[model samples]
Target: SGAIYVGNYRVVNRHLATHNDWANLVWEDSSRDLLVSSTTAQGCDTIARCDCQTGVYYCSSRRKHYPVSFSKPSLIFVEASEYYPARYQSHLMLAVGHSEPGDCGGILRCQHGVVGIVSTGGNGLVGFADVRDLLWLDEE
Candidate 1:
């Protein structure tokens, strides 16, 4: 698409107690460079663009969202991500170092596919996206 803004920013909501609401958005753009914006609890907002050709995500300023809420942190389109087959392999082994490790960082192997979650080292709860349908918002 031309100059399409994709949702790829990681989001974490504090209201959710079970797990930090974490989510991100991803979209394809015909434009070689895409701009990004992020803000933090401190009311800091920054903007930058990425050069898709190099596959490098760059920020001209500090991260859009800083000191972001880790409570409900999530990546956009996480539910749409293809399940990792490794989680289903007969081994049933935790993908070591596949991601940050600890109680909350540990990986879960599921029958539907390999699902990922961000944990608080057994201190808090983590949840996964259960979006069976895809919906878009109106840009009034």
Candidate 2:
């Protein structure tokens, strides 16, 4: 699969429309059962899927409440392909952090809902913590 580049980073990496919401690109490329989409996450919406048809254009992975501002920086091309709904968080960086280095503690949002968070990133892939697996945050 070819990737769209925003200089040294990959916005979208696969040509297949079947694998969008995958967590890691390293695993999605393999047939082995090492990693998977919707892995045993601990969020309330563990079975959540990005449905753009619902009018949710961008699923951000940020915390601390991003401002209600207008933007379209092509960060991961949240609207890249209308052919299929993408649930990917690999290159899902937000406004200011779009092309910058990793800043952990970010969130993963699908619509106005919290989905995942930025655990880390490099080479343009942002591995996130599925909001489901973070029971620690829910408690206290």
Candidate 3:
């Protein structure tokens, strides 16, 4: 549960910890959701997650031919919680888009209001796609 600083266009508070070859970011509040960025070995970066509040970023899923990066001027919005999966009722899902991949993007989902941020597969230039409406069970 993180709070977004509308004025600064950044999270009010956040925490990042690195172990081995992976870096994990935890939000101050365990309620709101947050986003993350990762890069590949070839200088390719991606905005992996959008609504991830806190969670373990799998290095296997994050590590690639390059490094992974996150969003710089991250954006946050308030949406209905019912749209999240049963496990992630507390949180919601985040859709991520890449610059090179084009339409082949990824989705970041959470429950109990927790989310994760990281890139998958080979590293490349990536960024946030869009923070659209929450995808709840009702839509399913």
Candidate 4:
């Protein structure tokens, strides 16, 4: 089998109130050395490689670099609820931290996942605005 690259920077989209729009989401890693691939959602088959050591994160693609200031690496993969078909299901997603305790910063979600920024109650980041009535977006 071909070697699988884990930290794949595939797509960045904005989390909005009504819908999710495409936007540039930046991330930093401080816990461990990471191997990143500059493969976009449109061009995932092509691979451009770069190394991200502790305390730094590569921006957008694999060329630029920046410093990260979190105690531990805020980089994490969030598990989201399944709402779409099998083809559109995503098990894990790349997510960042937000200033608000219950709010997540820039988060990468799958098609069947939540489409908005704040979690309206239930399982989610702490201290952010949430509405429990909505069903599709909230995780069970």
Candidate 5:
């Protein structure tokens, strides 16, 4: 509930990739605003929390931590979210447009329910770091 920082802004390891090493902090919102008409865009008013749980049970082992066979499978917790597109065949990635700074550590939701969350941003694209695959950190 207070400010939290995750991910490495600097290099920790040289052998690994930085993209996957991306992370989020809280309350950062560094993007600017746009001004346009209804046909163009809207100004002043602004947006947008979530998780991909409920679809837990798998015939095969994968997606997080150590090896464990017959692990968790997945389903559309927020069914409507399936209507969107993603990076690859993997659920660990998504195709988010023009991202804001603080969006990284927040939940991404819709009218129906929670779907996914914010991870990396600043570019015209925002990448997803699925909550399910993000438990490799300490939580005590």
Candidate 6:
């Protein structure tokens, strides 16, 4: 279990080794119920058990439960890529928008391993889409 720091944000919880081809962090509001689990990826399928009261979360790895904290929580973006045995590539992307009064964002890039900003309101590009709906899943 190790601490992970990226860009302007810091995760107080122990860094869980990513074992799947893709995973998702599901959270709502200020709750520490930020679940990290494999969606449609392959291998080592598992999910994170979140303890919001203690501000901690851990996966099936059962690593040391470190109190989770974030220095900046405005925005976060995560991307990962990996090569499969069938001579194919897998990619994962997760982006989020926030209503905080700061311009702090975090980005995580992973290449066979494990990887944001804001602007003023001047007739800019406002995009909205469902991350889950846009994901490319395995054909049954």
Cα lDDT listed for each candidate: 0.20, 0.31, 0.27, 0.23, 0.27, 0.21
Root mean square deviation (Cα) for candidate 6: 16.4
Q: Estimate each model's TM-score.
A: 0.18, 0.27, 0.20, 0.18, 0.26, 0.19
Checking candidate 2 for backbone clashes, the offending pairs are: 21-87, 42-132, 42-133, 43-132, 60-109, 61-107, 61-108, 62-107, 63-107, 108-116
Runs in model 5 deviating more than 4 A are 1-91, 110-112, 132-140
RMSD in Å for candidate 1, one decimal? 16.0
Assess candidate 6 and give its lDDT.
0.21
| Error at 84, model 1, angstroms | 28
- Model 1 Cα displacement at 129 (Å)? 7.2
Predicted structure with the largest TM-score when compared to the true one: 2
> Model 3, clash count?
26
Give the CA lDDT, 0 to 100, for residue 22 in model 4. Answer: 20
- How do all the candidates rank in terms of TM-score, highest first? 2, 5, 3, 6, 1, 4
Model 5, position 125: C-alpha lDDT score: 44
Q: Write the per-residue lDDT of candidate 1 for residues 5-102, one digit (tens) a residue.
A: 21433222111212222222232111111112222333211122211111111111222211111212123221121222112111011111212112
Give per-residue lDDT, candidate 5, residue 129.
33
* Model 6: number of backbone collisions: 5
Q: TM-score of the candidate numbered 6?
A: 0.19
Ordered by lDDT, highest first, the candidates read: 2, 3, 5, 4, 6, 1
Expressed as tens digits, the lDDT of each residue in 44-131 for candidate 6 is: 3111222111122222122222232222222422222131122111111222222121211121211211111111101221111111
Candidate 1 local Cα displacement, residue 77, angstroms? 24
lDDT of 3 by residue, 37-102 (tens): 222322212223344332222232333222233443243343233322222212322223232221
Q: Give the per-residue lDDT of model 2 (tens digit) for 1-140.
A: 21222122222222331354354332332111012223233434232243221211122333234432222212242322332253343323333333112234343455545444343344544333333332333232
Instruction: Give the winner by lDDT: 1 or 2.
Output: 2
TM-score of 3: 0.20
